[PDB]
From Swiss-Prot, chain A:
<keyword id="KW-0808">Transferase</keyword>
<comment type="function">
    <text>Catalyzes the phosphorylation of methylthioribose into methylthioribose-1-phosphate.</text>
</comment>
<dbReference type="GO" id="GO:0046522">
    <property type="term" value="F:S-methyl-5-thioribose kinase activity"/>
</dbReference>
<keyword id="KW-0547">Nucleotide-binding</keyword>
<keyword id="KW-0418">Kinase</keyword>
<dbReference type="Pfam" id="PF01636">
    <property type="entry name" value="APH"/>
</dbReference>
<comment type="subunit">
    <text>Homodimer.</text>
</comment>
<feature type="binding site">
    <location>
        <position position="218"/>
    </location>
    <ligand>
        <name>substrate</name>
    </ligand>
</feature>
<dbReference type="InterPro" id="IPR009212">
    <property type="entry name" value="Methylthioribose_kinase"/>
</dbReference>
<feature type="binding site">
    <location>
        <position position="48"/>
    </location>
    <ligand>
        <name>ATP</name>
    </ligand>
</feature>
<keyword id="KW-0486">Methionine biosynthesis</keyword>
<comment type="similarity">
    <text>Belongs to the methylthioribose kinase family.</text>
</comment>
<keyword id="KW-0028">Amino-acid biosynthesis</keyword>
<dbReference type="InterPro" id="IPR011009">
    <property type="entry name" value="Kinase-like_dom_sf"/>
</dbReference>
<keyword id="KW-0346">Stress response</keyword>
<keyword id="KW-0067">ATP-binding</keyword>
<feature type="binding site">
    <location>
        <position position="325"/>
    </location>
    <ligand>
        <name>substrate</name>
    </ligand>
</feature>
Length: 381, 369
């Protein structure tokens, strides 16, 4: 058999949607250069397709990621179908996912920067977190089943992006970092900080080795669609078997990153979201543990409590890496880069480094999410 | 289907067909071990458990042979479909558990196994390997059925009133004390969760004294059928526990060689792992002062915790050790088995308190006086 992959265009995408049985118009609406996102109208549909390195950032990547993203979306839909787009069709060789159109929603990072507060965002994401992370763990699944899922969701290339960018590069004078010269005194203070780098190393080691559950792997505010009443998580291409606290930490850090871009009393909705997302995660995870654990140890008093404390500790450490990583690393966030005037931008970026560092160092000292919030507020006054 | 169960005649046929008298000498019912005489061993899995364990065993032995060829039997041929490994004959050696029970002291056993542990455990980790490579090895060495036996027998069944357990009734009061101990069971749960999730290196997975050939001058580790990507501390802990199990079967001053072994195996492990880390780590963090030290402390902590589960598991679970079961008279056996439970319990609960291997040894000695 011949190679089946062919790069879609707007006409090809309409032809595909028809051949698959789902007068039409199509527009390519993709935000980056690694994927095409084809919007098809009249009822609407999205066809997403991975772009191979030769035709593309980038970042040399195979189109295998499309298989991960599709399979991860489908898995999430079995547990939280109201919190992810529906998937109608997918194909590994064509590297295509056909999914629900969510054009009536706005990317959460964009809305947050515009000053939208999204009152239910943390309640929805906390539920997403609690259910996705529990139901794919050894707590919820027979170990033989979970062990096959580890193989199926092994994601070497995309893991390599996170291992480098989240956990390694910002902490050294590496080629991928990207920061203003005004920041250099403070960046160098990080590079020279042995005790924080040792802690980042341990966190990386956990990312590399702790195959606890199927994670989303890139759950930032730009990876969520939002309106006042709805929330949908997208693009689980980084999915693999990793630490439970990782997704929780990345999301929380992106909430703090937005808080930093804001001023004064405007920060309060974000601090409320940090509190609510932890609380809802913990409640959701705990309810799932109680009802659906297969573990004979699950209902011994203190075991769930200690499990949550460890997830919490790692989540805050991971949050700290993300705070740092987004500030001086290859991949930045609009929350910080669009701060004006310039000297304010530098000052707030200095604070993301300082808060990130404190999170990493003090992760095992915090007892509750409010301790984390209260420490943050003091540091950013 | 290409699989056919060998007999003594077809074993020699295979050895000749591969261009390399016969007696089946296997000490269990799941594998045939054919000795052919220059000499050769042909091990074959029999078809409850998949014959895929033979592919794991061969692959694991070969990988071990890349780093410690002097400490594992050489492999000449292997075949997944036939479930065979053709390997070096080690008939001139004795199973270390048997020798230890007979009173052999094996002066180099500790230095040899410590070297085996340091090198096998380092060189298959993320410390030594590109993460993309390690991740392929994780897939290759996934071992669901064998891992299942360990998850059940080492980490679960002894801590509850489960059907697989096997203990003398005189031991019941002390068994029920363990079952009723919430805080120890929570800690066993955490160690099981680490076994289930922490894919740190390719481990042997069943490194007890019955899995080692020994003489005065030579040591060879065998049967890595349980191999998979698991916690670095696991093999270290199981081995140490089996040294302590032999100490419990001995009396007084005759225990000293075993305590010496426990000390030397940790020391040699730590030294070997540290030397490899220093020379062969790919990690940009490797050389920050404190990171290796903290890495070792965590390995140590887990090892002690896993030693505790192995002490308990061997005493009251499905799979016993001859060290304990052959103690006479009865009443002494029961006493020594109560101590294996109490020491294993202390190891699990106190694992993060110990600062050095000496602390572990001294605590054990105190308890078993
Ligand atoms: C001062 C505010 C109280 C806010 C409020 O009351 N509103 C709070 C609430 C949580 C507190 C932190 C954690 O406890 C962890 C850690 C424990 C050490 O012991 C000392 C350092 C550190 C970072 C603590 C400092 C300070 O104490 C914090 C930030
Ligand atoms: N289901 C959907 N409904 C409506 N618009 C969608 C959509 N999926 C994607 N889009 C549009 O396409 C953009 C790109 O989506 P997505 O984040 O999946 O692409 P990407 O994977 O190429 C980005 P990255 O490289 O940062 O991960 C979105 O921000 C959105 O505007
Ligand atoms: N390389 C070798 N050289 C000489 N004898 C060997 C040998 N490998 C195995 N044997 C002999 O056969 C016995 C069974 O070997 P082994 O322990 O590998 O098998 P097994 O896997 O069937 C046991 P278990 O069921 O407990 O795991 C050994 O105790 C030893 O006496
Ligand atoms: Mg993407
Ligand atoms: Mg065996």
């Amino acid at each position: 058999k011949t190679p089946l992959y062919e790069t879609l265009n707007e006409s090809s995408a309409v032809a595909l949607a028809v051949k698959l049985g789902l007068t039409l118009t199509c527009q390519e609406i993709g935000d980056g250069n690694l994927n095409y996102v084809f919007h098809i109208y009249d009822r609407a549909l999205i066809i997403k397709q991975a772009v191979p390195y030769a035709k593309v950032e980038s970042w040399p990547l195979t189109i295998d990621r499309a298989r991960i993203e599709s399979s991860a979306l489908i898995r999430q839909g079995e547990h939280v179908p109201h919190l992810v787009p529906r998937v109608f069709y997918s194909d590994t060789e064509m590297a295509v996912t056909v999914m629900e159109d969510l054009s009536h929603l706005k990317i959460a990072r964009k809305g947050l920067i515009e000053g939208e507060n999204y009152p239910h965002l943390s309640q929805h994401i906390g539920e997403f977190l609690g259910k996705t992370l529990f139901y794919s763990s050894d707590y919820a699944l027979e170990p033989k089943v979970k062990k096959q899922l580890v193989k199926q969701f092994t994601n070497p290339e995309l893991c390599d992006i996170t291992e480098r960018l989240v956990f390694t590069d910002p902490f050294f004078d590496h080629d991928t970092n990207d920061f203003e010269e005004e920041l250099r005194p403070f960046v160098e203070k990080l590079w020279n900080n042995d005790s924080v780098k040792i802690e980042a190393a341990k966190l990386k080691k956990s990312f590399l080795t702790s195959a606890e559950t199927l994670i989303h792997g890139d759950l930032h505010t730009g990876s969520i669609f939002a309106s006042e009443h709805e929330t949908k998580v997208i693009d689980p291409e980084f999915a693999f078997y990793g630490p439970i606290g990782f997704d929780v930490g990345q999301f929380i850090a992106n909430l703090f990153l937005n808080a930093l871009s804001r001023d004064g009393a405007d920060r309060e909705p974000l601090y409320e979201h940090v509190n609510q997302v932890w609380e809802t995660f913990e409640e959701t995870f705990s309810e799932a543990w109680q009802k659906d654990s297969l573990d004979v140890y699950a209902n011994i008093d203190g075991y769930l409590t200690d499990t949550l404390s460890h997830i919490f500790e790692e989540a805050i450490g991971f949050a700290g890496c993300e705070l740092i990583r987004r500030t001086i690393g290859l991949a930045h966030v609009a929350d910080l880069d669009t701060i004006v005037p310039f000297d304010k931008r530098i000052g707030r970026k200095r604070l993301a480094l300082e808060t990130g560092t404190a999170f990493i160092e003090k992760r095992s000292e915090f007892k509750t999410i409010t301790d984390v919030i209260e420490l943050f507020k003091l540091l950013v006054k």
